[PDB]
Structure formats: C-alpha cells, structure tokens
Amino acid sequence: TQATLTSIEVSPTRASIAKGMTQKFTATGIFTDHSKKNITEQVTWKSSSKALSMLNAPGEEGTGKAIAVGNISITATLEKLSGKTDITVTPAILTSIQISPVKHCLVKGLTEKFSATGIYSDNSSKDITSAVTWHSSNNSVATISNTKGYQGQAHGTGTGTVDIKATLGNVSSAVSKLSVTA
Ligand SMILES: [Ca+2]
Ligand SMILES: [Cl-]
Ligand SMILES: [K+]
Ligand SMILES: [K+]
Ligand code: NA
Ligand code: NA
Ligand code: NA
C-alpha cells in the first residue's frame, strides 16, 4: 500500500490461438518497491477488435475468446496506466471426428461407405472421409479401405462384430460397431 503502481505488463507477449479457443491473459503490476503482483482480476481488460472477445462473466476476467482469424491488440488498464500485448487468431483446429454410420448391419459380401466428419474448435465441420485413416479391429469380419477413390469403403468379409474408427493426427473418432451377417 506504501508502494505506487508504476507499470502494467500483459502476458503472454506473442501468442496464437485457434478460432473458437480461449486464452487467459495475465496483468502484472509493477510497483515503486520493484515488486510484481498479479492484478488480472483488478484491471480493466479490452480488445482492439471483434476478432477477440474479452469475456465479461464473473470468473472470466482477462479471458479472450477467438471469434475470427486475425491480429488483435489487448490492453489492461488501471490508474490510467496501460499494459498491452498482441495475439494472433489462427484457423479453427480439428478437435473431434464423428463417423457415420454410428452403427450398422451389413450382409457379408457387400460394401458400405463410411464417412468421417471433422468437428473444429469453432464447431464448424467438414467431410474428411479421404483425409482420415480408416481402421478395422478385425479384417476377418470387415476390411476398410484407405485407397484413393475407395476411402472409408467397408466390405463384409465374415460374420461377427468389428470396431471401425477414423484417425487424423492425434484426433480419433468414436468407435462405430459394424455387425456383419450371413
Ligand atoms: Ca506484453
Ligand atoms: Cl501474436
Ligand atoms: K465482446
Ligand atoms: K473424436
Ligand atoms: Na486495445
Ligand atoms: Na471480425
Ligand atoms: Na462367414
């Protein structure tokens, strides 16, 4: 309380966040006694553009939400002093994969086309059937192709049940239970 505030630093200094994701900013107060203090909950936060929304709800103080791709300047203000930083919003990232059909009954000797829908960090979606790698837990029940022009093509090779899944980098679809009948 004896110390006067002399500066505000906002961290991080450079950062990238995917569209639809969020970032917690920190406001660090610098004082005449050379102490540093977390003043994130005390400062006034603002953003230079709609592309990053500073969240207003209690407990969200200093949280920015990526609305649109671009460059945004962020400011923390207290006692007419301001600290600033820059953030970059990058394109939405793959967060989940939904495969269809969710379950299926296939007659042996027939072929069924599975599709993979990528769900992104802004909850946009895309057909990524040809981009994913398709997997079968048991080729003796069904095979599934990754061959160009046949991606997601599942062929009933024998009776039973099998797990079908799609993967793309570190993202994996839910398992689809494929039953093959005679
Ligand atoms: Ca900074
Ligand atoms: Cl940046
Ligand atoms: K806003
Ligand atoms: K997933
Ligand atoms: Na600003
Ligand atoms: Na915008
Ligand atoms: Na069989």
Side-chain angles (χ1 to χ4, degrees):
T1 340
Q2 328 94 39
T4 301
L5 184 68
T6 59
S7 186
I8 301 169
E9 298 280 353
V10 176
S11 297
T13 276
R14 301 284 309 278
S16 290
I17 190 189
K19 192 183 168 307
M21 299 302 286
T22 61
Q23 159 79 58
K24 282 204 259 155
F25 292 99
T26 295
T28 304
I30 316 297
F31 298 79
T32 47
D33 64 358
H34 306 303
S35 60
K36 305 200 294 288
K37 201 180 83 156
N38 188 324
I39 57 167
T40 298
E41 297 162 37
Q42 277 70 241
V43 295
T44 295
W45 293 99
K46 78 184 179 163
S47 158
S48 63
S49 100
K50 177 190 292 196
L52 190 89
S53 190
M54 300 306 302
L55 297 186
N56 283 329
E60 282 166 359
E61 284 80 9
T63 301
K65 179 180 187 75
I67 302 304
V69 164
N71 302 122
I72 313 92
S73 290
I74 307 304
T75 303
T77 297
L78 195 66
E79 300 186 4
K80 307 191 176 58
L81 309 172
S82 65
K84 304 177 187 188
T85 205
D86 287 297
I87 196 159
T88 296
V89 176
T90 58
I93 54 166
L94 187 67
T95 54
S96 56
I97 301 167
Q98 182 67 43
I99 59 172
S100 186
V102 287
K103 72 166 194 190
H104 194 70
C105 192
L106 185 56
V107 176
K108 184 189 181 303
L110 296 178
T111 298
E112 198 69 35
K113 287 186 274 138
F114 278 77
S115 65
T117 304
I119 307 304
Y120 291 74
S121 40
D122 60 359
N123 291 98
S124 63
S125 62
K126 189 163 327 195
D127 169 33
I128 55 167
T129 300
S130 77
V132 297
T133 300
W134 293 97
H135 311 262
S136 167
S137 66
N138 187 354
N139 292 143
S140 292
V141 167
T143 60
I144 193 161
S145 192
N146 288 294
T147 304
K148 191 165 281 286
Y150 308 86
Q151 297 102 316
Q153 181 178 281
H155 188 73
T157 52
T159 57
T161 300
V162 69
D163 292 356
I164 302 296
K165 183 173 59 172
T167 60
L168 187 44
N170 64 17
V171 184
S172 305
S173 80
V175 161
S176 176
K177 297 297 192 182
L178 171 56
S179 307
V180 174
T181 190

